[PDB]
Design an enzyme around this catalytic site. Structure first.
Site, PDB file in Angstrom:
ATOM      1  N   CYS A  41      28.652  37.788  41.147  1.00 57.48           N
ATOM      2  CA  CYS A  41      29.404  38.193  39.966  1.00 57.48           C
ATOM      3  C   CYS A  41      30.750  37.437  39.924  1.00 57.48           C
ATOM      4  O   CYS A  41      31.772  38.003  39.450  1.00 57.48           O
ATOM      5  CB  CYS A  41      29.772  39.698  39.978  1.00 57.48           C
ATOM      6  SG  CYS A  41      28.291  40.763  40.145  1.00 57.48           S
ATOM      7  N   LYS A  61      31.048  51.640  47.539  1.00 56.09           N
ATOM      8  CA  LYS A  61      31.415  50.603  48.556  1.00 56.09           C
ATOM      9  C   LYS A  61      32.078  51.215  49.788  1.00 56.09           C
ATOM     10  O   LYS A  61      32.313  50.549  50.777  1.00 56.09           O
ATOM     11  CB  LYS A  61      32.435  49.610  47.947  1.00 56.09           C
ATOM     12  CG  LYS A  61      31.505  48.702  47.009  1.00 56.09           C
ATOM     13  CD  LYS A  61      32.068  47.347  46.610  1.00 56.09           C
ATOM     14  CE  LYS A  61      31.184  46.664  45.447  1.00 56.09           C
ATOM     15  NZ  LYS A  61      31.954  45.937  44.434  1.00 56.09           N
ATOM     16  N   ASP A  77      42.250  45.172  41.072  1.00 58.20           N
ATOM     17  CA  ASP A  77      40.844  45.501  41.300  1.00 58.20           C
ATOM     18  C   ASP A  77      40.744  45.700  42.817  1.00 58.20           C
ATOM     19  O   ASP A  77      40.804  44.740  43.609  1.00 58.20           O
ATOM     20  CB  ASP A  77      39.969  44.360  40.785  1.00 58.20           C
ATOM     21  CG  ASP A  77      38.535  44.396  41.302  1.00 58.20           C
ATOM     22  OD1 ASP A  77      38.151  45.406  42.007  1.00 58.20           O
ATOM     23  OD2 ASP A  77      37.747  43.465  40.927  1.00 58.20           O
ATOM     24  N   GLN A 119      36.998  46.020  46.757  1.00 54.73           N
ATOM     25  CA  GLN A 119      36.674  45.494  48.082  1.00 54.73           C
ATOM     26  C   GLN A 119      37.787  45.776  49.092  1.00 54.73           C
ATOM     27  O   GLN A 119      37.575  45.615  50.283  1.00 54.73           O
ATOM     28  CB  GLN A 119      36.367  43.983  47.920  1.00 54.73           C
ATOM     29  CG  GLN A 119      35.999  43.356  49.242  1.00 54.73           C
ATOM     30  CD  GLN A 119      34.657  43.856  49.817  1.00 54.73           C
ATOM     31  OE1 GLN A 119      34.484  43.886  51.055  1.00 54.73           O
ATOM     32  NE2 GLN A 119      33.728  44.115  48.963  1.00 54.73           N
ATOM     33  N   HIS A 164      36.124  38.825  40.153  1.00 58.04           N
ATOM     34  CA  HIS A 164      34.786  39.301  39.865  1.00 58.04           C
ATOM     35  C   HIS A 164      34.719  39.473  38.335  1.00 58.04           C
ATOM     36  O   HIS A 164      35.740  39.707  37.683  1.00 58.04           O
ATOM     37  CB  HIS A 164      34.702  40.683  40.610  1.00 58.04           C
ATOM     38  CG  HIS A 164      33.387  41.370  40.467  1.00 58.04           C
ATOM     39  ND1 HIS A 164      32.916  41.967  39.277  1.00 58.04           N
ATOM     40  CD2 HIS A 164      32.485  41.654  41.433  1.00 58.04           C
ATOM     41  CE1 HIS A 164      31.754  42.571  39.523  1.00 58.04           C
ATOM     42  NE2 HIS A 164      31.463  42.368  40.836  1.00 58.04           N
TER      43      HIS A 164
END
Lengths: 405, 405
Positions: free
Chosen positions: B361, B224, B198, B201, B121
């Protein structure tokens, strides 16, 4: 302006602490919220939360319109010319750091000066200390008069043709001084500098008009003006923002991303990396609606009344020192002779009264005042003279109590 | 794990859009919240909002205990060793920028490499592009296999003894790929690099254990994982954070402030400048309690079931391409032959179905996939197979509709 009807809208005021009605006199640390704001966050999460921009579905359009709708409410509330000048941030401190990182560190060289004052909060000191160190520039301080105000002659003396930035509080969170920002901006611009205004303590309490003040940058926090925590604004003149690079990088603030090089969106989204503070920004728009409906001029008159009343009643107390000028915002920072302010605040809380003790994030100012800490009572649109009477009566009893032991 | 009882707790699901029941399949853009979270924010603003730390009054103590209490809930939820390693930020994007600013820009020289992947991303691309440009280091990309996974042989090839940082997604927001982070961390450390993960998610959808993964830094977003907007976490190993300087400067993160020089607080408060995201952090603690009570393993099994079911039903559609591997997180990114994904998303919203269209993104990944945009349906703990049937039936009707015209 009816204070009973205003207080009825703030559920948190209606409770007891240590068996006494709560008397909350710490709004300069953070303000309380009315149902209009809390129910705005509830309606957001209950009905139309979704990610914003690139709107393809109905809730996403609603959240987007809510978020950018609140940007317009902020623009009108401070009288900026354009939404491109209104950047949502997590608070005044991040807003001032963005100026120090994207503006100062790009525009300072050896020999350049950043000029601040001794009464600044740390948020409007430490970013500049870091930017000058990074660039080899020089930091300078405007001196204060004996009542804790700034004279424009001292400004003119301190600011020179090597000054590139003047950064100054609109209102001091300790002295209650309202600084002469519009005349300081003229002195900065006459010298080729921009002026950065820390508006954290003015925006909640008095009308802000950035076109009249002619400030180059203005920073404020939602949590001080009846709005949610975690959100703030950076206003900058559009021509300055257009030339500044982003302080943070990621999705949402790009136009094109290649493997090694990227280009940025237009303002204001160039400065808003990642999923934004959607609920908090919409709730800060509700707080602005709420304050606007009461009237900021009315809230300033109420606070002037409370401050004049507090200063008079403090002068009735023996052995109490109040710091700063007679003409002031709605707060009183003080010390009792021979009692530590932390002990003052502890015993006031046993009577239900909430005040703050410490340096109030202004260590250079405490040094200037020759004290190591102070106590502070601060007022807002839901406070009353009866609450001030409770404070002064408790200070009297505190004085006697520490006398007897 | 009863999906009727889980859905009953999310008021936003129970409404119609364009006369159809809402079918919300965009949780990878942002998740919806249960009453336990929304009522946590309400109780905060209704009962104990106050500024935190330096606690002298009763509400201030309550807010402080709430805020630092949620820090401990996060530490336990990702299995960090200490609260000193848990920094509250405004979201994953700010967390990754703090690593790029405070860690990368201090530790990269000409000849050093930062290694990322084509599926990142933008939040985990553009900070590194900027840090390498700032330092004269080099950015490198790990290639992908044809199904959109990463082989450890490619990792070993890409990462060299000049690599100082590997940054990689735990789970891709487009391919649904779950990356082999624990084995990548070993390859980074074998080469003298740190690994930055990261986790935006992965954290919502599967258990995170930073001690088992052995990541050096891990970033996540509240919005999220059923939590409030505007808040996130940066986890870093304590020995790395101790040596990094702050990314932002101001009140609350100092110990001593002189006119020109300041010293910082201990971790984690060294990295939290200004009044923090008090309500949002407490609400992210409530979201963690909520997810923990359901069980992250149960939520991962539910999503595995939904993803297997979706992939099968998509293979029943003629003229539809799905991107990425068979083993995956709960999302499906796809295109219809000959229909633009924005038009797919528009007509799905007319049937009440919320999905996202665009580059998500991830522009370098769309380029890798040879497409200019894609549509994505993503799932979470409140979605059902019936909703997937509604999506595939609507895609069929979309296909026929654009065929007839």
């Amino acid at each position: 302006m009816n204070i009973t009807d205003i207080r009825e809208q703030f559920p948190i005021l209606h409770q007891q602490v240590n068996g006494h009605d709560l008397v909350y006199l710490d709004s300069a640390a953070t303000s309380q919220k009315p149902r209009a704001v809390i129910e705005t966050l509830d309606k957001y999460y209950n009905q139309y939360n979704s990610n914003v921009h690139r709107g393809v579905h109905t809730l996403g359009t609603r959240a987007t319109d809510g978020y950018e709708g609140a940007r317009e409410k902020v623009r009108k509330f401070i009288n900026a010319k354009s939404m491109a000048e209104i950047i949502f941030t997590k608070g005044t401190t991040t807003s001032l750091n963005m100026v120090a990182l994207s503006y100062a560190r790009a525009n300072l060289k050896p020999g350049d000066e950043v000029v601040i004052t001794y009464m600044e909060h740390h948020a409007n000191i430490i970013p500049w200390q870091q930017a000058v160190k990074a660039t080899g520039a020089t930091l300078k301080y405007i001196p204060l008069q004996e009542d804790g105000t700034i004279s424009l002659e001292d400004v003119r003396e301190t600011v020179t043709s090597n000054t590139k930035i003047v950064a100054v509080s609109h209102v001091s969170n300790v002295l209650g001084t309202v600084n002469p920002i519009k005349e300081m901006a003229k002195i900065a611009h006459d010298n080729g500098a921009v002026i950065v205004v820390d508006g954290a303590q003015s925006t909640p309490h008095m009308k802000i008009d950035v076109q009249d003040l002619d400030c180059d940058f203005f920073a404020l926090s939602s949590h001080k003006m009846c709005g949610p925590t975690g959100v703030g604004v950076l206003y900058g003149k559009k021509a300055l923002l257009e030339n500044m690079e982003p302080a943070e990088f990621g999705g949402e603030m790009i136009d094109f991303v290649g493997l090694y090089e990227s280009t940025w969106k237009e303002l204001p989204w160039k400065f808003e990396a990642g999923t934004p503070i959607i609920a908090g920004a919409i709730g800060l728009g509700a707080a602005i609606d709420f304050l606007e409906e009461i009237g900021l001029d009315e809230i300033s008159r109420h606070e002037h009344k409370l401050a004049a009343y507090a200063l008079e009643r403090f002068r009735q107390l023996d052995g109490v020192t109040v710091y700063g000028p007679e003409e002031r915002a709605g707060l009183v920072t003080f010390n009792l002779d021979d009692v530590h302010p932390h002990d003052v605040a502890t015993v006031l809380d046993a009577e239900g009264i909430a005040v703050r003790a410490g340096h109030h994030c202004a260590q250079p100012l405490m040094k200037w005042l020759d004290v190591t800490a102070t106590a502070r009572a601060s007022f807002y649109l839901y406070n009353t003279e009866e609450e001030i009477d409770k404070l002064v009566e408790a200070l009297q009893k505190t004085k006697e109590y520490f006398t007897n032991v």
